[PDB]
Amino acid sequence: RSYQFWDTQPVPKLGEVVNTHGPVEPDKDNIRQEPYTLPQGFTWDALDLGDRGVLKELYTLLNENYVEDDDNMFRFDYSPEFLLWALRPPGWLPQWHCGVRVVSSRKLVGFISAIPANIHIYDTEKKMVEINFLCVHKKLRSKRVAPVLIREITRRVHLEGIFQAVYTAGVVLPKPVGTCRYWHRSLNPRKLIEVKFSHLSRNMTMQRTMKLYRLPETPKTAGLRPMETKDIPVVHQLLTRYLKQFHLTPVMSQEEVEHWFYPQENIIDTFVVENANGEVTDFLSFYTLPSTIMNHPTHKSLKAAYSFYNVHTQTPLLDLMSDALVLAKMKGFDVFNALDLMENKTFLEKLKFGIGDGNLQYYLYNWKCPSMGAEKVGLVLQ
Ligand SMILES: CCCCCCCCCCCCCC(=O)SCCNC(=O)CCNC(=O)[C@H](O)C(C)(C)COP(=O)(O)OP(=O)(O)OC[C@H]1O[C@@H](n2cnc3c(N)ncnc32)[C@H](O)[C@@H]1OP(=O)(O)O
Ligand SMILES: [Mg+2]
């Protein structure tokens, strides 16, 4: 393989073994003032997501043109309110919600975003951005619009004095810092089989399968309740302490922990364990991201929960994650998804998750370091 675009970028080569830790190139001290040129007939437009019409145009571009599974059966369906949670966290900047429109019709056909984040990578903490929501309309694919969108958001980030970034993708590019796998835990196996997310497995009847996946109707952990405003400080303390053990993690302020964890229905759920002394000792969290089931006459949507950050100090993680399943089931989810990062491999098989297809690769831009095992990746992105 060569990479016509990625070979020009300050990332390590696929196959180069990395022993050192540091930037790939030194920081730029004069940056290009003009936007990169789009192909004829298309124009940049910075999207004001606080305008409901504009946010709905972004909802529509992503609903019709964003990530599908490996078999072209399911497409993410991020909701407008979820996209406001994902894209306006503390420190968001309007120039970093970077849209491409057709000049004549004004139709939105491309987007890429950055949001700021402090990242801990081995022994270094650096201010970075997280790049997400790169999308080109299906009618514009394979025309090298993606390199323009990546160079343009690179420029706009460099203008604000930031020279590293973190991102994930399901394709292999120069050069993954860590390689993760999604696993899936059936909550509504009948629907999952029916829409062919799942198959009737290996000598089990549907009757047996529904039994195999049946869960308790209420969680078992004493003192589990939703996170409230008074818990913001201790959730922040728990998380900060917990993440020290991994090699790629976010460093969140208390304002960022309020944004990422405070519960918002149909977006983000966080439950804390408040013990018999009134102290919060653990928490679990998961976010809501349904998928469209394409071209299907009856079932139009699959409701999935995604494991976010789960912190245990007194409750065994196995038991916390069992309660997350019970909770997602009560909340009407069809499937609970989790990656094999952090300590998750200690529960995935025990709790009857099955491995999925594909991988999720993590990447750093303009930062060279040794790659790490999934168990040392402690960052989860939307
Ligand atoms: C300091 C600040 C730095 C900030 C920037 C940091 C870097 C951020 C990097 C981006 C992080 C994004 C994180 C997420 O959002 S990952 C989610 C990505 N989105 C989707 O999968 C949605 C559905 N697919 C699409 O919309 C398009 O197929 C996309 C837009 C993905 C590519 O459009 P198209 O298919 O029409 O292709 P092209 O002809 O224009 O371009 C072909 C070039 O693009 C390279 N390519 C393909 N897929 C990806 C990918 N996911 N990341 C990076 N590069 C990608 C490909 O290898 C080739 O380069 P090279 O092989 O020739 O070298
Ligand atoms: Mg293209």
Numbering used by the authors: 115 to 496
Quoted passage from the original study:
Comparison of the first crystal structure of NMT2 with that of NMT1 reveals a highly conserved active site, consistent with similar kinetic parameters in simple recombinant enzyme assays. 1 binds at the protein substrate-binding pocket in the presence of Myr-CoA, and interacts with minimal disturbance of side-chain geometry, suggesting that it binds tightly to a pocket pre-organized by binding of myristoyl-CoA27, and confirming its conserved mode of action as a dual NMT1/2 inhibitor.
Protein N-myristoylation is a co- and post-translational modification in eukaryotes catalysed by the enzyme N-myristoyltransferase (NMT), which transfers myristate from myristoyl coenzyme A (Myr-CoA) to the N-terminal glycine of a wide range of substrate proteins. Both human NMT isozymes, NMT1 and NMT2, are expressed in most tissues and have been implicated in the development and progression of diseases including cancer, epilepsy, Alzheimer’s disease, Noonan-like syndrome and viral and bacterial infections. N-myristoylation is necessarily preceded by proteolysis to reveal an N-terminal glycine, the only completely conserved motif across all known NMT substrates. We present X-ray crystal structures of human NMT1 and NMT2 providing structural evidence for a highly conserved protein substrate-binding pocket, and demonstrate selective target engagement and pharmacological knockdown of N-myristoylation by an NMT inhibitor in live cells.
